[PDB]
Amino acid sequence: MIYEGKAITVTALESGIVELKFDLKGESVNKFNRLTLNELRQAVDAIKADASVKGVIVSSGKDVFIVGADITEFVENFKLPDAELIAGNLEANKIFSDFEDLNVPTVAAINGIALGGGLEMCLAADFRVMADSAKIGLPEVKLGIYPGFGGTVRLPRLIGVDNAVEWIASGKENRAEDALKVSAVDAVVTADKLGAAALDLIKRAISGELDYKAKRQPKLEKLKLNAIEQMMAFETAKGFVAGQAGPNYPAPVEAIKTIQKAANFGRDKALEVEAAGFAKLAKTSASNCLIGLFLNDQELKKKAKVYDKIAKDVKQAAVLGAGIMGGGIAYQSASKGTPILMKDINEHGIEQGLAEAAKLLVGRVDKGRMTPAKMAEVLNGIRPTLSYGDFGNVDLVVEAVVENPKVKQAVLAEVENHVREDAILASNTSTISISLLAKALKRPENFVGMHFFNPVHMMPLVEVIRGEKSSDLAVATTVAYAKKMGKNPIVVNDCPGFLVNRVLFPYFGGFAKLVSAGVDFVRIDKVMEKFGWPMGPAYLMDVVGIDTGHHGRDVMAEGFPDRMKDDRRSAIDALYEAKRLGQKNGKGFYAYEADKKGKQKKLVDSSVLEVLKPIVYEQRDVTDEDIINWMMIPLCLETVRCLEDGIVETAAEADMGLVYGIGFPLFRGGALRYIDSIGVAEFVALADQYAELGALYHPTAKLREMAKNGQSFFG
Amino acid sequence: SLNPRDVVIVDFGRTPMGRSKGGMHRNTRAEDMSAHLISKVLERNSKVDPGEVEDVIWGCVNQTLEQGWNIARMASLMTQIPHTSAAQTVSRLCGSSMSALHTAAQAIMTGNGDVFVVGGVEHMGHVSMMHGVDPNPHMSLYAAKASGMMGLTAEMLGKMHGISREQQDAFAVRSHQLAHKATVEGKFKDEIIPMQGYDENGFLKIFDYDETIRPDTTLESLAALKPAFNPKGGTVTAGTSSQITDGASCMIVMSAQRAKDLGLEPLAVIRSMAVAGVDPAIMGYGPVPATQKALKRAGLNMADIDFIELNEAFAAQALPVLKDLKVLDKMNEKVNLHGGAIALGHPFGCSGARISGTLLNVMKQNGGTFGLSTMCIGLGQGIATVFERV
Amino acid sequence: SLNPRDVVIVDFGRTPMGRSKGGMHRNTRAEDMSAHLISKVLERNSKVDPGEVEDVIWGCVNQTLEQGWNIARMASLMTQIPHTSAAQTVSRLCGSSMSALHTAAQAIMTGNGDVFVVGGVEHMGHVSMMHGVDPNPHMSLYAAKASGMMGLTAEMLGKMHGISREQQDAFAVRSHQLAHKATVEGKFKDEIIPMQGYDENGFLKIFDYDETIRPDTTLESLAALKPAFNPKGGTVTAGTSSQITDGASCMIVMSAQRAKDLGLEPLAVIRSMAVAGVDPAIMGYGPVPATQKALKRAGLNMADIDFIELNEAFAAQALPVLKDLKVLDKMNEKVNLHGGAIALGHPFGCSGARISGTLLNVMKQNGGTFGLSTMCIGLGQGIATVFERV
Numbered sequence A: 001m002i003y004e005g006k007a008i009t010v011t012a013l014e015s016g017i018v019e020l021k022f023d024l025k026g027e028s029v030n031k032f033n034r035l036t037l038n039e040l041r042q043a044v045d046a047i048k049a050d051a052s053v054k055g056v057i058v059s060s061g062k063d064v065f066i067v068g069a070d071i072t073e074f075v076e077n078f079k080l081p082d083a084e085l086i087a088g089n090l091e092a093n094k095i096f097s098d099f100e101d102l103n104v105p106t107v108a109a110i111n112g113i114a115l116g117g118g119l120e121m122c123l124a125a126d127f128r129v130m131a132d133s134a135k136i137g138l139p140e141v142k143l144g145i146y147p148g149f150g151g152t153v154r155l156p157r158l159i160g161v162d163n164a165v166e167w168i169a170s171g172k173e174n175r176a177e178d179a180l181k182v183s184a185v186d187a188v189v190t191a192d193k194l195g196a197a198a199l200d201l202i203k204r205a206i207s208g209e210l211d212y213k214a215k216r217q218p219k220l221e222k223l224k225l226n227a228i229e230q231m232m233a234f235e236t237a238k239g240f241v242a243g244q245a246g247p248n249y250p251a252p253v254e255a256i257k258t259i260q261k262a263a264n265f266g267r268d269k270a271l272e273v274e275a276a277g278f279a280k281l282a283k284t285s286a287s288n289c290l291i292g293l294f295l296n297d298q299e300l301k302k303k304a305k306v307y308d309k310i311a312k313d314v315k316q317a318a319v320l321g322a323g324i325m326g327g328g329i330a331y332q333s334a335s336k337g338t339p340i341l342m343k344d345i346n347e348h349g350i351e352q353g354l355a356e357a358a359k360l361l362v363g364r365v366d367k368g369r370m371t372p373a374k375m376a377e378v379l380n381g382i383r384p385t386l387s388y389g390d391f392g393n394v395d396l397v398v399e400a401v402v403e404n405p406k407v408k409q410a411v412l413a414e415v416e417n418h419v420r421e422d423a424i425l426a427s428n429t430s431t432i433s434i435s436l437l438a439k440a441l442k443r444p445e446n447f448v449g450m451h452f453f454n455p456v457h458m459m460p461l462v463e464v465i466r467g468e469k470s471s472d473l474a475v476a477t478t479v480a481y482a483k484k485m486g487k488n489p490i491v492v493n494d495c496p497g498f499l500v501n502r503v504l505f506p507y508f509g510g511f512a513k514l515v516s517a518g519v520d521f522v523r524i525d526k527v528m529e530k531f532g533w534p535m536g537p538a539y540l541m542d543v544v545g546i547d548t549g550h551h552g553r554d555v556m557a558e559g560f561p562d563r564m565k566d567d568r569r570s571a572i573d574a575l576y577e578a579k580r581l582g583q584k585n586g587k588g589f590y591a592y593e594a595d596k597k598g599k600q601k602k603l604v605d606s607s608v609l610e611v612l613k614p615i616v617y618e619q620r621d622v623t624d625e626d627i628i629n630w631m632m633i634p635l636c637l638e639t640v641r642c643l644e645d646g647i648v649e650t651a652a653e654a655d656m657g658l659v660y661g662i663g664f665p666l667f668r669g670g671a672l673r674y675i676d677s678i679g680v681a682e683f684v685a686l687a688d689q690y691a692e693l694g695a696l697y698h699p700t701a702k703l704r705e706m707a708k709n710g711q712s713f714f715g
Numbered sequence B, C: 001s002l003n004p005r006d007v008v009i010v011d012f013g014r015t016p017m018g019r020s021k022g023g024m025h026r027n028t029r030a031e032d033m034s035a036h037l038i039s040k041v042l043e044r045n046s047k048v049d050p051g052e053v054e055d056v057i058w059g060c061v062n063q064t065l066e067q068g069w070n071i072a073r074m075a076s077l078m079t080q081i082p083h084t085s086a087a088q089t090v091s092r093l094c095g096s097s098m099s100a101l102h103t104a105a106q107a108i109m110t111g112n113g114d115v116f117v118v119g120g121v122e123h124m125g126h127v128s129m130m131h132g133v134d135p136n137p138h139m140s141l142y143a144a145k146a147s148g149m150m151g152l153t154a155e156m157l158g159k160m161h162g163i164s165r166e167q168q169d170a171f172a173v174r175s176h177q178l179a180h181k182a183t184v185e186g187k188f189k190d191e192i193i194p195m196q197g198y199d200e201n202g203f204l205k206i207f208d209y210d211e212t213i214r215p216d217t218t219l220e221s222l223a224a225l226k227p228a229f230n231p232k233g234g235t236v237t238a239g240t241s242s243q244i245t246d247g248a249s250c251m252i253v254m255s256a257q258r259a260k261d262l263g264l265e266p267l268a269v270i271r272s273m274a275v276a277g278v279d280p281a282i283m284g285y286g287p288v289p290a291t292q293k294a295l296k297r298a299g300l301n302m303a304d305i306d307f308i309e310l311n312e313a314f315a316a317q318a319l320p321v322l323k324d325l326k327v328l329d330k331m332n333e334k335v336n337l338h339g340g341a342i343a344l345g346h347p348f349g350c351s352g353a354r355i356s357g358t359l360l361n362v363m364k365q366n367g368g369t370f371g372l373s374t375m376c377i378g379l380g381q382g383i384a385t386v387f388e389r390v
């Protein structure tokens, strides 16, 4: 053949068409390691040298196209000076650039996952065919760096600035439907007819029907945006990200500055820009380990895969208790192709559930987003019941009974005698130990914790609280079942407050202290919202409910008395003892007066000051900068404790749980990454001046240990 | 003297501008609202045979549901207007209603009709703006998507010309204040056509004022609002932005010839028409280009214009336009003397003829000769019209 | 010789008419389809500076989702057309595209612009017709609701003039046959602009023909279909009705003056424009009134017209229109020689300029002098245009 490497086999085909195949012999996936990039060079030069070639088709002999890059072998090639680094990436880009300069049609038949460098290889070709069951994206940002193989060059000119900035800055994966809409892909087909599409497409490029040359041009010249249109596009992008990324900007805020500069440039000059900025991130922002974020993701994609195919298929499901949480779990399970049973004790309950599930379905149809025929299927998927007669074929059962250790145990143990023995049981509790509930059951191995967040259809995160006697198969099935319901599950070990909530209140502890220090909460949340948080502390408290937060406080206090048991009336007790129960009541830190069906208003009133007076113990002065510390430090440290006590298994999972749950500023990474954004050694120093506030601001021993060692959580 | 094919605006009648968030029109369709207006306006002028109406040009933007399927004809069919007449709906976002006036004007001038019924309508209550929107990703390949958000453009154009939060809020106060005055003094009695509606209690009654107006609007109350399109460092607030308003505006137009024959005194006469384009990012700057083109076509200098009506989309955009038009120091003397879209609301498909109609009443009332009505349009456009009192 | 302000059609270009039910345009937005067309058409004419385009008048009906928010500008911004130009969307249901041609025409004549880019688009695949419809009950107080159902009107108009099931099916056959003929012989090569699309296998390829055409359409195959709008005694079948088609049509227009200056030979010249109204119940009769008005303004007799383009809404309506126009016995000699909406589909906001554009190609190809393009409109309307080859 033309070329037979260990990673790439350039095989010939009909009509002079050649097929460059990616198949890393020996490994499970394809990736751009040293060996691969080297063989690509040899492959491209081979095809390039061969004048009989009339086209090139790029494929993969794996389940995935080409995943990320195994950066572990590029690390030594980052410690070099910025010149020997830029020129380094430049030389690497010469490959793709040349492949892009091949005087012949080139198509990329994407069969599976094409992330990071994998997609950059595709962006190089002229045309791109994709299987409807595939995904593509540039998650480089999660590593503190942005595309280094022409990603910031081709994507922006291929799909458009706004679309590129979005795809890159976020680093989100994209399905066929979405990839086709923004025109990142040119044709989506079923997995079976992928090869035929690539072949049929190439031939149409050769015949001259399709102008492969005209399609390539867009990513070789300047952007089509006006000088003015650029100012608007970039400044808005930079601005929005600047506010939610904050001071230590990884790939987000930089990626845009790289595109804004290389805007009026062509490929070659744009590559230089991309390379230059890439060096800056690696030697500054990400020097405090890019290795960690990467390997951490590596562990996850494999973990999520191990869980993925040992997991039991959930064809039939059911939920205990209708109404609020039950109607949601039933809705989500129904809208994602999973027949669910709404079990309850009284007819009045089923009514509430069916009603809420109906209100959501009609909500989309009454505007145009859901098909009337679709609402029918979803509704039929949900099957009401007041007994366990049909629980015979249910694979996974979820509990939503009232918050009561005793009650939940009775209910759980009850259903266990009406389902298969190999069926998995899961509680949705939030303040009760899973390891405690499991004791009632006679099959604890199948019992775990599946935590949803109100509203079930709004919040993405679903905690998979593993008990002490929970089998892997149990967790695997639950995790998978969550993903199928369009969620983002994360495995967390059983502990008071689990991960999210356990970290959410210490955060509020810093708030409670502020209010007690004469700090205006209005100023507080305006600063926290300027930090990147969706809702402010005070405002959030109102949404959750002062009565709720008051109960949760006791739940955490009893859990970890050594640091979460304060004993001085705070704004929490003040409002509660003053009948100001929050947003549901109409009065909390703010006032809420309702307009009509779907809208209510947040107002301010000096009457709240009277209630808070008894809480003010000092008229302490504070800067908006300190306000952020009184809040973030307590939250970050608790995360470190959740990682040390073994509540979360990896730092990666310890942050996403905050990103999807509490709503941690996305472009800031997470609680742990934020720490690195300051420097572990420099973070402990910061914590110490606030040590006069309590055990909530005291670095752990393991943190101090890794403080002197210049160790950070991502490595 | 008269030129046979000269465009003449015979009359003008608008509906009471009511709030969309549960306002006085929450139970009335856009079609009917338009049909009733056209019908009532034709009544005041019993000398213009509805049968002569060669065509009814209505402006409307979100043409779907109630406003879809050529609302011009749908609203014209429920009018005394014969089935023998025609009707078309012209959409140009904000300047839809004004473009309608231009289409008829040109028709009359070229001898393709004698009597027309132009105007526009927009019931943002029943057919909200964000309703049924599908952003084409491909647009980001030729222009910033952010430019699609009128607010952000106001912020951008604002920063450039340097307009302070105080400067904007101060403008909003001027608008509300001047709107209330014009209302109380009865400077609206002629243009506003009483119309049935429902009060906050579901009761049936006729309104003849503008709910949108808020007399209590003070610099203090405005300085309390938060940035609507840019929380972290913004000036454009809901207070300095036009209001979401359901409303319709009508205008009977015809040739001076067929007019002279009917012996009916003209309200105004169109001298020049102009439309121009600008970058979407700063669409609010559309007026200046469109105005300059109109002045040149009308052979007049900006100074020759006695009164001006600038659709107040955002205080952040109106002010810059007025500055470059070099008439900011003449504001209180000849610019929006009855308030703007901030206090009177801005019904997309209606604002075009509404501001022009109001412009005429200002001239007639203040003995003006030359008038100018212009407005900014979304996605980078502008439109201007120069009338004349004779 | 021509007068300075005489409207001249420089060029005409349309997209391949593809089926909506999974056709070749199933993955292409209406905006892009239009933007691409306008862009490509301007290319063939390298002597008309896009910057001179005073305005882009685009026709569209269901203006929501992809087609909402003044698609004229949305599609214009992705073109080489500068941001300094303007754009407006004109809706008149079926005759939208044609009204666009008229608006620009009158503009040019009145000295409000020199170069224009008119046309229309309608992607009934992504934005179906029945999508987002809210029937106003009050309409039944002034007109029959049934008149809203184009099909039923075809039935009524048909009954009146007496057109047998065979007479209609035979018409559809003539449309398909003639369409295929013109296609095969390349009588469409000049107007049809090759465009990217996807075949039934999701594969990417360029189409240069009209999927809608069905050569196998025989009287036998059409006599098998059942009444679509009236099962118990009907003649109007899906076969004799226009097709649901996604497509766009473009047309560069300018004054003879600015045209003579560029030394580019005209394609045709507009001599008269007309719009008329009829009762909604028999809206299909709209052409005759609109035509008669155009002929009078053009100072011509129906006999002076060499070629005729009557948009085929239904065989039940086209035939009656041709009979009253007294040219049924001249059909095969000068009426829709390249087929109609029955075989070429009928994109609401597009057909207006498409039929007119094709009309010019017929004249040019067959040495015609005077041409006529007319079509019936929903809710009782009509529109006609009389071109001239010089």
Ligand SMILES: CC(=O)SCCNC(=O)CCNC(=O)[C@H](O)C(C)(C)COP(=O)(O)OP(=O)(O)OC[C@H]1O[C@@H](n2cnc3c(N)ncnc32)[C@H](O)[C@@H]1OP(=O)(O)O
Pocket: C094, C150, C214, C216, C217, C218, C221, C222, C225, C228, C237, C238, C239, C241, C242, C243, C244, C284, C311, C313, C346, C375, C376, C377, C378
């Ligand atoms: C005034 C103006 O300018 S325009 C007036 C407005 N008119 C319109 O918009 C068009 C109106 N037409 C319609 O709404 C639709 O086409 C309808 C309602 C008439 C028909 O739609 P439906 O009820 O869905 O029936 P449908 O379109 O599926 O029928 C297709 C069948 O007819 C057959 N068919 C259609 N045309 C032909 C033909 N020319 N020759 C042979 N068979 C044909 C197809 O083969 C198919 O048969 P199959 O299903 O066995 O494969």
Ligand SMILES: CCCCCCCCOCCOCCOCCOCCOCCO
Pocket: A034, A037, A038, A041, A068, A069, A074, A077, A088, A089, A091, A092, A095, A115, A116, A117, A118, A139, A140, A146, A147, A148, A149
């Ligand atoms: C999810 C991971 C994202 C992967 C995307 C990869 C982006 C990272 O870029 C890596 C930087 O590249 C450094 C260049 O290496 C220089 C050594 O050259 C290799 C040998 O090739 C020589 C060819 O002549």
Ligand SMILES: CCCCCCCCOCCOCCOCCOCCOCCO
Pocket: A344, A345, A346, A386, A387, A404, A405, A406, A407, A410
């Ligand atoms: C903080 C601790 C508080 C302890 C509370 C103790 C509660 C113990 O109560 C036991 C649970 O009672 C179960 C109620 O029984 C319901 C039976 O429903 C039968 C429905 O049958 C339907 C047949 O169609």
Ligand SMILES: CCCCCCCCOCCOCCOCCOCCOCCO
Pocket: A430, A431, A453, A454, A455, A460, A501, A504, A534, A535, A540, A543, A544, A548, A549, A551, A552, A553, A555, A659, A660, A661, A662, A663, A664
């Ligand atoms: C210990 C018992 C106390 C229970 C309180 C649970 C706290 C969780 O709040 C849930 C209610 O949600 C309302 C507030 O919304 C928060 C906004 O977060 C948005 C998440 O953003 C995700 C971005 O990816």
